[model samples]
Target chain A: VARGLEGVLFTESRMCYIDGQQGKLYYYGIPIQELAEKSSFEETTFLLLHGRLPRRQELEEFSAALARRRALPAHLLESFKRYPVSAHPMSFLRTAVSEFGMLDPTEGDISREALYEKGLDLIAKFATIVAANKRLKEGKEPIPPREDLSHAANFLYMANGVEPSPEQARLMDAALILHAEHGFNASTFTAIAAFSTETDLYSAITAAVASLKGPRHGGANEAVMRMIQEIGTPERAREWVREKLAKKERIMGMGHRVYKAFDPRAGVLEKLARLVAEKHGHSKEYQILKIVEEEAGKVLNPRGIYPNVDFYSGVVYSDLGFSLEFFTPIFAVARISGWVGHILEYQELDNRLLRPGAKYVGELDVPYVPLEAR
Target chain B: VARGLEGVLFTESRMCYIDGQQGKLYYYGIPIQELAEKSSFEETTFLLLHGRLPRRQELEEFSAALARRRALPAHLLESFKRYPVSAHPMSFLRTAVSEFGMLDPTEGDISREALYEKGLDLIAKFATIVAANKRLKEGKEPIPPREDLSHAANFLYMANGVEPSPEQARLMDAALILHAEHGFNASTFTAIAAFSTETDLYSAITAAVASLKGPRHGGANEAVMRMIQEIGTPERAREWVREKLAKKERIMGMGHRVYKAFDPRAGVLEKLARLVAEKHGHSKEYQILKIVEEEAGKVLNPRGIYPNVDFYSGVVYSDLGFSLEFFTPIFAVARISGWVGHILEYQELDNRLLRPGAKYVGELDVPYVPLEAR
Candidate 1:
């Protein structure tokens, strides 16, 4: 019996390969670094969904299909208006996605083509949903999706009600590619667990969103930003690290459960964070994060603890004008591709229900007391 | 490497004990049979949450607390009106509950007392959400929850727009008690998985609801009803079983993954199914299910496959005036107690993030093909 099922192989998959010791991450056998450098979110999503890189025609067709499906249902947008401005962006996104399942006519159809269509719809509409919630909370009218813009550029456009520069768009696209897929993370597993029961894809993905809302999972990015904001300056980084250590508090986003060496995504994201920080003239937050990493590494490095993806992704996100709370929702917008890909793959595989047993350690056969006797 | 983490002891839970071989189940050491026979859903819920039976005074106070929180937030209800009438009850309930986290002022409070308060609110509000969805879907105005009614009666009252008979209410209470907690089932595991990430309780429970909506888990009751409806008569039971076996198709609810003998809850629910069917002079569904169980058992019993909880649950629910689609939502209403109990207990235990590693079998070092070259 493995606690947390750590190191336990649940099933075989051809989706992702994570060499934690080697600090490498791959999707469908291709290294994540390659995807981050060369692939768009649309292409990477196609690769994940189809298990190989898309050819020229396939890539264009897939990208066009995603762009075509980018609009949210008007009623869904209307529903978003009712959510309080104080609502957590993740909560609003989670609820809106489930409502999408209700509004969808083909939600119950689980055929391969139907799932593909639904998956594409979810991937496209998620950006719109997130942007809509963001604008709604800001009391700004949401901008309609722009077809001419790429997925990453369009999300930024919708979110901020303005077009992103080419450099900003490229950085956001690379960020999405970096965050798109990883092997069976908590949110991914939650999606699989829900989908394994042969539920509709929306429920499964909604569950994934809920799981991602947790602080220890996709919320790590948000926490990392919060940590950076708390430090406030590079000069205080060492003291902040020391105070947290002295108080026995965790330094969020520094260590990861999977990666023994530096997370490969973190390497890609660090460079992107640098580029974005330079563009935005927001180097102080980036510098403070770097200092904290160096200081914490002195104590944590020998134990195989180092910066993971969340460490630098939030810095880049902030550079792109995203608020701290939107950090995890942005993670979901990218990770939904992975979540859908895995769910599709699992459906094609054995597709067994992911039910596991627990060790019964508590006492049994205790006599029940009547309510009055308690 | 265990698929589905089968036989894996993920964590130590004091909330439930199951002896699959002996067909025995308990909540915090007290036998479920005792709870099903002698206690109300309110009392069983208190026991699961507090680890002991509530005193007379404690029970009343808890009951009142649940009653007081039973109305849906007006804005939340207004939001529900926008969902299509064709929306699955589970979909509406899942989204609304997540929104509840947004509406809740104390959602971020993870302290013991605060969680207990939040839990009571969830347990109370879930029924309102489910019942309200049912009414809205049927184009009826939702009935306000009556404080005079017991938890079981109020749910039925709100759902049907009429109060249940005393005997009917007692039976529904027993059904709720029987379904209240089971040891670390899929939905429960999903809840723990979400909560283990240090997410809020609402998100965790929403994840649980998403998992429960799957047919292999809580949706099994709905599937069982569909199967019986397809069979139509007891005379067709043997042929249906033989045909399904010949085609290697699943006979829904005939087998459980864990139990090597009869399921304890099935035994309790079977009696209730018979009682309700006899009471309504609608014994055809019960009769058909019995024959189906007997015929399937003949072929399955030697293999340790027997009628589980879901086999008879639909019949009792159908008798109680719930439609087939509402079966899983009702399960959520009852299982929310278990989900919240496990989450609260986990918060107090050595709560670590439940992130597990996947064995990577996919190839690495594949060269990335750029879009133009592909």
Candidate 2:
């Protein structure tokens, strides 16, 4: 049996490319660090979807299209009042996306333009949905998206109830760019698995949101955030790392499935974290994360283990004033573009059912005990 | 690249067994035919979950537990008014399950007991949710479940606004049993993919419903029903099938992924279809289905293609008064047990993240194209 499907390859893709040993990730051939440094989430999303950097006119039109779509139906937020405060933020996103399927305009049309429009619609609204739910959890009314803001900035505006500073918006944009895509991660694979069945785009995105809720997948950064809080201070970070290492405990966010060296996104997020901390006054949290990374990497890096994207992304998010509960929701908002981009990408490839086999290791000859016999 | 993941194995399972060449399916060593013939849906659900026939007392206790939980939370049904009437039935199911996740009692508990009870909660409520939505779609108030009715009977009562006769209830029970489990099909695999992330059971189920909504998965029966309606008569069934066969066109419901010989569930449902038609007066639909099966199977069975579970189950369902759109919803209702059964069984085994790799076929080091270059 292919336990964990550890070495199995699913499909060939021109989307996100990851060179695990080299710790490289590129969306349509643009490296992670470069995108994080130079591009906005909208540009990066277009690049991921269109497979090339957009011309100025094309990008402006794309951004305008998205900005116009940055609102949820009133009924969707009204539905939010029914949920428990303890519900995972991703749960609301999951339910909200499934609700979006209720009104999908092109559900019966399988044409490329139809799917592109549908994917675009989802990309535009995911941040709105996530932020809306985050606000409701805080007992605050949802802040409607502004026509003037970028996708990343609008997300912060809705969730935090204020427009972000340029530096804060830049950090959010870079963080989103860093997470925009990864080749066949659990959540993305889950989306394609559903999409492969030729289900509507809403179903695909809904499944992806649910997959992202898993603690092993998109919930990683939240765990890392909690671990940093547990460590409490920079002075305890080294000691905490040593205690975890000595007990053979997993130090959350310190490693990844595909990254043997430093996760390239982590490199970008780590640099951004330092800048954000210096600007935003979370230097203590930032220092603790850095200390833990150094101490943990010293012991585990020789074994191909290093701090991952989740490691520093959590610090950056906390510095940006997102509660830990919203970390995965923020991931969902940023990752929505990648999810939809892959759905559209795969629609042009050999779109077959993502069906695999199972080895049945049980008996078929055991006699059926009738109810009377029992 | 394992395109379609066609022959790849994921994990070893003891929950259910399928022999592709022999077309044999057994849930915990009980042949599907036997379960369909003699077991109630409740008993089959218990057997699937517990891996053995429940004793009389145990079955009564289990049945009572399920019976008591059959009604949806009134607020859940109240929220159903927001969905568009044209929304696919499976879409409503997907959203409803995610909403249930919002209130999962043991979200923080991973113990077997916790997972088992949570799985049971979903199993009990899925039928109620599907039926309630069916009623609302038809301009009728959602009917509450009755403690006196069997699982299958309550589903019919809730959807149809009338209690089922014994034969109708029995046939519904058998159909539910047959569709209860199939070994790692797309929808089930989709569920496990989400579940493997250690996400909540509701997320896993929500993803499963989305995957099942695909035309290639749970929607197969609806397509078969449409094709039968298109064929229009028993007199044209043979001609219609032959014309399509001569053109080398695909026929819905006449093939399956893992079945090389006769699909055992199809055989069971075919028998029930004949019996139900005799009792319920859809002889024309039954005869048309029969003529097409014989004509198509004679031509395609040698190629190892045969009538599948969807073929006659649609006929039986229509005979029992369900419309085409309701076919997959009923499937979601019946199949919830198997989904939760596998989930519970795997919870006690070697559970791991179902991560697969993707081969990157894109370029690297493509220089960043500046905005001015565009």
Candidate 3:
């Protein structure tokens, strides 16, 4: 028995798979490439919920359900306002999710059906909270979700209060499908840790969001953007990459811990990057990114490292006119569905708390020292 | 290296220790008799916090600091009202804690001083949240904190809206201290896991609350209460327990995973239990509980099984005039302090996202199945 072993949970859920050596991606047992190319975000979301791609009527019904749940409850918005202007948006989101639990009051019974409903509601409403927080933080009035738009389209419309271009919509949809779930990642582990308590989806997802704020996880996209900015131009790209390697400074979005080969999602995202570049005539950044990626492959391939999804996703996001920092928040929008999926499954299993024993490494029975003694 | 090994991690925090050889309790890091004779809950909590007893001003300062942070934020009450009346209080409290983060905007900075302050604040304010939720759930007006009282006193006052007697205060205080911290328990581990993301205390503790909601972990007291109620009489206790064992229904609060003899904390709690019982003129419930403990000890001695902290703590809580369901919420009051302490430590380490590698157990290279495959 690996006592106190970290992150080796054996559980069941129709969610993600991380091909550590191959760097593949899947959501609800479907390959990311298939979903990215063949399905809308709404269709993918319905798949996550029901374990199958939705028929046309199912898609419409799912979209309508999401739209109906999109408005921020008055008290929830007020709860967000109660925080300081400088508060981390993640913190507000955590509280906001839990507050939603208050909308469904029942005692003692943590049934599977209740958890599934909670999970769906959380997935539906999270984008609204994310967009609302971003706008509110910037001193702008929050935009309500537009019922007319699809999931990807509505998210962008709510965040920016405008319809996305057809090309941009494709890019955003691919991003969502690409990032929706990965097998037992940090945020997913955190989500599962919470669900082990038989808590509702809101609390579990809120905790997962907290985990996502770490620089090593969802924050990598920001680093990718920063790397691109420093590269400055296509001419500097190869030299900059070599210099960063010489200094032993990790290049974000280049090397992934799991993927030895090129990430499958990165391939899809790279195609989208090209489309965005051609559409907007912003081809230089994509060119620079490729040079950096190729150079990184040559140098780091000995260590089995490769460019991850974040590498090209960052390039596409930059082309799409979002700030570098928004890359992580964008991750939240997609991953919310997956987080809720795991939480609901956990509730279905009798709600056991995840209490793993640790091999205590600290000094045993040390007495407290007074401050003066020091 | 133990891939997908289950049972290495015990899901229930209720069992103080699981002696794999002779499964029984190890309360407060000692056997029950030793703990009952010498230890107090305060001493045990102190041990968890500082890893030993506080020498002089350390204990006083820790207690005072805890007291200072107990006042709940004004806005959280309004936020609580926004939750549906039937909403799970755990969800409400988790969300409310995030909103509480708004009151202290300085928590984002990764400084030891800042984290320590946040820890104290979390410990202080969480008591009020726990009690407030209890009150609100029961259709009573939520009571705010009174700065003039100790943590245990304030918790009772808030829960019942009246100050407890000194004797009652001592009993509750001991309970709080006993429950305050244990090395790497489920909820503490949840907080630590969240902290691995380099997120703030609010996020960490929110995760901890979610972990605490599991029946196998913090919910043991609730289960214990249910068992006691079902037995209904002291004479019926042995037959009932025997039947439960025959059915393989886990007798909550008995047979810890870590301790081979008895939980050290259980002994401490046992003393407190007697103190409370003597004060209230020992109820028939207490007598019935004693017989159950003795019989279980004798029957399970070959396996070294014994009662955990929850066994006696449940009786103490019942005697103190709280509903059986609210027992776990009271646990949050003291545990908030421990979770905060760990969150502070993890922040100091500045850990990356806790992305642990897993041994793949799923099918590899399986062709993607279309929706109509069935």
Candidate 4:
């Protein structure tokens, strides 16, 4: 029977690595934490594409190349004017990507050099679009990218046209690095699965993004923010947690399928959370949260459910004065780098149709009943 | 283990149904084929939302209701302007959806009435954004929606401002209804997963679109076109399909997880394919695709593989003079309705976090290597 394998990996790929048993994550051959703390998002991105970290000069040249590709076409902008502002940005983005591939077509052959350039171009424009959507939704004029700022800082600065606090900027930078890639997850699988037909990177990433938008995969960060808002304050934490647990309600940030003990990314974000809290003098809320964690530990840990990266992300995002709702959009910004990286890797490998089976449970040969008969 | 049980239900709901074994499909409680053949896309949408076919007066009222909501905020278009033509449109669209919820502020509530309106707003705008993106990419101005046209006609007319022949329009309409909903499929699961947080429909559908953009799922229509293009002609089908199959390459339309016999949607589309060919005075490439079925039956049918909806959809899409790559985006126009329907149904249920566990297969307690150890 094909039960339980619809989205599960019945086969393995070497494109990305996740040592879930050890709570370790990697893209290509690089460790996630090293990329998160030591490397800028662009440098880590270059490493994922080229299979090794770039030297200082290599990194500078790579960043410059992406900056050159940051301009949106005027015609594409004109097209936007016809639609209601209420259209989902991702649909706009996916159509834009498909259109981008049409304007700048890729060759049949996949090359490292070609993919690297494409990756930079894709990531750079992803930031521009995200920031533009944010600015436009607020009824403000859209801003172009500044060549001077790194990708993470540039995305924030361009969207708001003001430098973010060093703390918030740092958190955004780390968040991007952390999510850049994770072994053959749904969206990654989506990219590979779609690209197996030998389509270009634009088509592949478009497919991957669609997969990530799913809540079982990419929607968690957004859900986490909702949880925090509903809980409201530190005073409500214990009761909120217990009530949810008693009702068998899912605690969004508490567990992960792959990470049985603790998510390694959670450890990095935990430090980021403390740093954000100390900077803002929210030590009291932090203390209350710690107590809730201890109480949660007694109940949840027994079932091997612990906090994943989303656990403290709400705290970091909240401390930055972001609306709880926008936290996931921020997650999307960082994940673009990872989605692009995976698309490139999948293109390089043997692209095959992902056709896992299913256990048939519906009645067969029952004859179709005409609508009027009912 | 919690494998394969994310957002799964042990009992069925009237919200949606998937008779995979019988290759039958529906949204809410209506048959997809009936809706496709009998109603315009806009009225079919009303049927999905209201759970019954609309009367002539009702259809007119619903179409007017959607048209009234068609004027997007100027800021959203301004945001699209900021994205480099190089940005992936899906990314733009996903971000726009999240921002839609953020900008409206009022849109984020989970109240049934509020979400129903939000879901309708999303469907109305998805076509607007999708059509706009196509025009923007082609260096043409986007056409404004015509109040007189139905939803499917509006998309075609807005993208090019030329009415599709009645046959082309009918096929496109049917394609939308057929593609509109599938029970507990990956993208619907995504919408339910995101909506489980009790957030707005914009965020949920945004996530759903992202999941659908994956070629292995919603994106398969594009791959189907590419596969047919590669085959080029009927004579090439046998040799090409045989070679790919010999190398174990999957024919994009040749297999499915649930349907062991014919995909019922294939029958509907197969009929549409002939209509398109007859109207265009072209030979039916889809009918010529019998070699593909014969080949699959000879080689892979023993394993229960068969042609899916994408198999014949390629021939019809190609016959329509649409580019092979855009097939999936057109799918989004149809699927937006289904995604919204699932979100509405799930909201009425006991929504919970999808926290399925996995069977651990890696070594525990592996020692971390210091940088120098490498």
Error of 3 at B260 (Å): 5.6
Q: Residue A12, candidate 2: how far off, in angstroms?
A: 0.6
lDDT of 3 by residue, A260-282 (tens): 67677877777777776787776
List each model's interface RMSD: 1.5, 1.2, 5.7, 8.0
lDDT of 4 by residue, B1-374 (tens): 22233333422346455666876665555566665566567866876677665666776788888876665666666565544444445544555554455456465466788878887888888777766666666777667778676676676777666988878877877777777766666666555544544545665666565656554566666666667667778787788877988899887777776766667677677787668777776654664466666766688778767778888776666665455555666777777777776666555544443332223342323332333443
What lDDT score is found at residue B348 in candidate 4?
56
Error of 3 at A86 (Å): 2.4
Candidate 2 chain A: minimum summed lDDT over ten consecutive residues — where?
Answer: A103-112
lDDT of 1 by residue, A84-193 (tens): 77888888888888878988876777777778789999999999999888888788988899999999999999998889887788889999999898887888888887
- The candidate maximizing DockQ is 2
**What is the lDDT of every predicted structure here?**
0.83, 0.84, 0.69, 0.63
Scanning candidate 3 chain B in windows of ten residues, the lowest lDDT window is B9-18
For model 2, report the TM-score of its A chain. Answer: 0.92
lDDT of 3 by residue, B245-326 (tens): 7787777788766655666667667776777777767876688788788777666667767788877787788887777767
User: Across residues B1-374, which tens digit of lDDT does each residue of candidate 1 receive?
Assistant: 56777666777777888777788788999888778878888988999899988889999999998999999888888777777888778888888888878897767667778778899999998888888888887889888899999999999999999888877787788889988888778888888887777778888888888888876787767778889899998888889899999898989888776677877777766766667666766667778888888888888888878888888788888878888888889988899999888888878764767766556567777889766776
Clashes per candidate, residues 3 or more apart or on different chains: 0, 0, 25, 30
* lDDT tens readout by residue for model 2, B349-369: 768888798787888887777
Q: Using DockQ as the measure, what is the rank order of every candidate, best first?
A: 2, 1, 3, 4
Pairs in clash, predicted candidate 2: none
Decide which is better by DockQ, 2 or 3.
2
Misplaced by over 4 Å in model 1 are: A231-261, A270-309, B231-262, B266-311
Q: In model 4 chain B, which range of ten residues has the least summed lDDT? A: B356-365
Model 4 TM-score is 0.61
